[PDB]
Design an enzyme around this catalytic site. Structure first.
Site, PDB file in Angstrom:
ATOM      1  N   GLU A 199       0.867  -1.163   0.000  1.00 50.91           N
ATOM      2  CA  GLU A 199       0.000   0.000   0.000  1.00 50.91           C
ATOM      3  C   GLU A 199       0.914   1.227   0.000  1.00 50.91           C
ATOM      4  OE1 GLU A 199      -2.262   1.116   3.456  1.00 50.91           O
ATOM      5  OE2 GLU A 199      -4.103   1.391   2.263  1.00 50.91           O
ATOM      6  N   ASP A 238      -4.424  11.105   8.307  1.00 49.90           N
ATOM      7  CA  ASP A 238      -3.167  10.563   8.782  1.00 49.90           C
ATOM      8  C   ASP A 238      -2.824  11.126  10.157  1.00 49.90           C
ATOM      9  OD1 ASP A 238      -1.943   8.556   6.919  1.00 49.90           O
ATOM     10  OD2 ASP A 238      -2.339  10.193   5.473  1.00 49.90           O
ATOM     11  N   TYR A 279     -10.844  -3.029   3.595  1.00 47.48           N
ATOM     12  CA  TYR A 279      -9.958  -2.510   4.622  1.00 47.48           C
ATOM     13  C   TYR A 279     -10.718  -2.472   5.947  1.00 47.48           C
ATOM     14  CZ  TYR A 279      -5.965   0.333   6.296  1.00 47.48           C
ATOM     15  OH  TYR A 279      -4.864   0.824   6.939  1.00 47.48           O
TER      16      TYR A 279
END
Ligand SMILES: Cc1ncc(COP(=O)(O)O)c(/C=N/[C@@H](CO)C(=O)O)c1O
Ligand SMILES: [Cl-]
Ligand SMILES: [Cl-]
Ligand SMILES: [Cl-]
Ligand SMILES: [Cl-]
Ligand SMILES: [Cs+]
Ligand SMILES: [Cs+]
Lengths: 255, 395
Positions: free
Chosen positions: A49, A60, A175
């Site tokens: 990834e 993030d 995911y």
């Protein structure tokens, strides 16, 4: 192509979980990033990834925020990232390559054109961090038109309608960010793409745990980048530590 | 699935990580419930009147228009408790937070006005408040930071990215994703993901509702145009909302032109940017050719934002509202003119709106026109900045 489908089939044959590391393209420079990526693969990464440096990465935490800064400090651009991707694929024909993107870099020059470029360089999947299933239609459509798997996050706070949507809309893998058994079972019930556990995977035991829960493998969302951060001053030690880590995480997936 | 439309034509939406969608859906539901609840509306009205000081005056400015056929009124949001229009919608959002059973508040601020408004509301209503502020902003807004701290708020500097309002914006979303069960994110403008552009408008719309009542009482008609500065969009949409269906009334938004549009050092994405997706919305952005978010610029900290709320982009696209820009130098002149001729010290943000109204008058001084400028805040905060400029010029 069918790189994820082929990997999962080969893994299912070997009673094996996938181990998938994340790194930021161009961190801490293009040359070193290419070498880092080759080391993850050599050490036993099943898939990759790869993040593209973005000015405002609102999904993030600080580990990856800092990776982006490092990459920008080295002058890294989306265009350079696509060059790198072509080079990586040319070296490594079968490993699935997924991008983690922010929406503006996908929308910037047109959504279709972005996915067409992904296809040209041999990317397999795209996760757009700030596009929820509710907003995903043009992204999923463009991905599938260009043979790219749209990846969706199934969060801890997922309800049943979300499970059905993620199951229906995602490809490649789901995911995984309700008990942990519940999600995995329902996703299988709804014929979802195989689930990869992505939640705080930093130890071998977590990898084996994910596989035992009925996931198809695990994604290490920041542990690799920590290793980069720590060994900046020693390129040689960095690669050594990277190898050792990926070896351990991979070994945990076989058993 | 939502109760209300998240889009204004193509603009808007909910471009957040999946993890944040329940938070936005919960907020929408609570808002829709609150809007139909007479008890909520009465509480909100009570705070606006008895705590914040509404209604705000509508002042006729006679000196500044002398010898022209312009009649100019200023809507005096500078007189609201806190010194800016930001207080209106913080009071509503703080009540929504309580309705949802939340005990904590997150807010972003650049200039500091929204952060102070969030801290004052938090102090009054018994919420624990944390304010994210770019480290660059913290450094240059010591006064506002201190007021927040006096009022019991935690002020968290943000060193990520360019260490400014956008990064402050990001850190707030970052926090909320993890904390939304206990904390409400008090977004400070009519932008971001749905339902914020809709909530912020409805909790600012008394600006325009009062303006309409006041102008009918004083003049017996509607204004020819209402004019407001546009940072993210809140004061302008608050002034515009109640006039949108009055087709004769011009709606004029003023973006910061900075050192000049041609310099690229400005904050005028609606007219000089490009549509992108960031901060949870599809909206005009200042951005590099390859889609990185650009740094804006204005002399005014409150206008220094490289995007704009989606309802403004929509109203522009259909021709209902017109958008213009005013440079640092034009805004500074308008500041000085209002101080000297009307005895009102305007925020440098609001000074952009005034500057465009002065241009409307001066360019065509025999045109009959009844104008209202939204004076979004008072300019006490700006006197040091203005001092240092006039000195560096030698005035
Ligand atoms: C007195 C005044 N007028 C206009 C604006 C411009 O903001 P809208 O367009 O009305 O939302 C501001 C902004 N300041 C913010 C930056 O969000 C802040 O305080 O942090 C302001 O303080
Ligand atoms: Cl390979
Ligand atoms: Cl992510
Ligand atoms: Cl008109
Ligand atoms: Cl017009
Ligand atoms: Cs006049
Ligand atoms: Cs702006």
């Amino acid at each position: 192509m069918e790189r994820y489908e082929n990997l999962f089939a080969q893994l299912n044959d070997r009673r094996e979980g996938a181990f998938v590391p994340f790194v930021t393209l161009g961190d801490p420079g293009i040359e070193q990033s290419l070498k880092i990526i080759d080391t993850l693969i050599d050490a036993g990464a099943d898939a990759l990834e790869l993040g593209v440096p973005f000015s405002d990465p609102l999904a993030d935490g600080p580990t990856i925020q800092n990776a982006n800064l490092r990459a920008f400090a080295a002058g890294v651009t989306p265009a350079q990232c696509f060059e790198m991707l072509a080079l990586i694929r040319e070296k490594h024909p079968t490993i699935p390559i997924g991008l983690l993107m922010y929406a503006n870099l996908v929308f910037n020059n047109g959504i279709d054109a972005f996915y067409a470029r992904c296809e040209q360089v041999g990317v397999d999947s795209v996760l757009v961090a700030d596009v929820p299933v509710e907003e995903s239609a043009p992204f999923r459509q463009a991905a599938l038109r260009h043979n790219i798997a749209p990846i969706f996050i199934c969060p801890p706070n997922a309800d049943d309608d979300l499970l059905r949507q993620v199951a229906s809309y995602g490809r490649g893998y789901t995911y995984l960010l309700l008990p942990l058994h519940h999600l995995i079972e329902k996703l299988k019930e709804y014929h979802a793409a195989p689930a990869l556990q992505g939640f705080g995977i930093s130890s071998p035991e977590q990898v084996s745990a994910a596989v035992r829960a009925g996931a198809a493998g695990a994604i290490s969302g920041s542990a690799i980048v920590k290793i980069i951060e720590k060994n900046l001053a020693s390129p040689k030690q960095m690669l050594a530590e990277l190898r050792s880590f990926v070896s351990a995480m991979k070994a945990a997936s076989r058993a | 699935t939502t109760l209300l439309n998240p889009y204004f034509g193509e603009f808007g939406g909910m471009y957040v990580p999946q993890i944040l969608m329940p938070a936005l859906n919960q907020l929408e539901e609570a808002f829709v419930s609150a809007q139909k609840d007479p008890e909520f509306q009465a509480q909100f009205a009570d705070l606006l009147k008895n705590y914040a000081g509404r209604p705000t005056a509508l002042t006729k400015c006679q000196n500044i228009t002398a010898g022209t056929r312009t009649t100019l009124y200023l809507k005096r949001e500078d007189l609201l408790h806190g010194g800016a229009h930001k207080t209106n919608q913080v009071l509503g959002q703080a009540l929504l937070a309580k309705r949802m059973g939340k005990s904590e508040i997150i807010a972003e601020t650049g200039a500091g006005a929204h952060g102070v408004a969030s801290a004052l509301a938090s102090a009054l209503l018994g919420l624990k408040c944390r304010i994210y502020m770019g480290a660059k902003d913290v450094e240059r807004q010591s006064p506002n930071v201190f007021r927040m701290r006096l009022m019991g708020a935690e002020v968290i500097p943000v060193h990520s990215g360019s260490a400014t309002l956008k990064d402050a914006c990001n850190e707030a979303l970052r926090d909320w994703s993890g904390s939304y069960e206990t904390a409400h994110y008090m977004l400070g403008t009519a932008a971001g993901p749905h339902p914020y552009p809709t909530i912020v408008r409805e909790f600012q719309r008394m600006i325009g509702e009062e303006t309409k009542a006041q102008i009918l009482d004083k003049e017996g008609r509607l204004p020819d145009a209402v004019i407001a500065c546009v940072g993210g969009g809140s004061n302008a949409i608050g002034m515009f909302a109640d006039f949108i269906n009055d087709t004769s009334v011009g709606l004029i938004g003023v973006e910061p032109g900075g050192h000049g549009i041609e310099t690229g050092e400005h904050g005028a994405p609606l007219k000089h940017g490009r549509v992108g997706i960031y901060f949870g919305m599809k909206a005009p952005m200042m951005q590099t050719a390859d889609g990185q978010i650009e740094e804006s610029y204005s002399i005014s900290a409150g206008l220094d934002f490289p995007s704009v709320g989606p309802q403004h982009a929509y109203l522009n696209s259909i021709g209902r509202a017109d958008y213009v820009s005013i440079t640092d130098d034009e805004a500074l002149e308008a500041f000085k003119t209002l101080c000297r001729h009307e005895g009102i010290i305007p925020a440098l943000e609001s000074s952009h709106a005034l500057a465009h109204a002065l241009k409307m008058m001066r360019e065509q001084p025999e045109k009959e026109q009844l104008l209202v400028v939204n004076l979004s805040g008072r300019g006490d905060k700006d006197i040091f900045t203005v001092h240092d400029i006039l000195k560096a010029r030698g005035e």
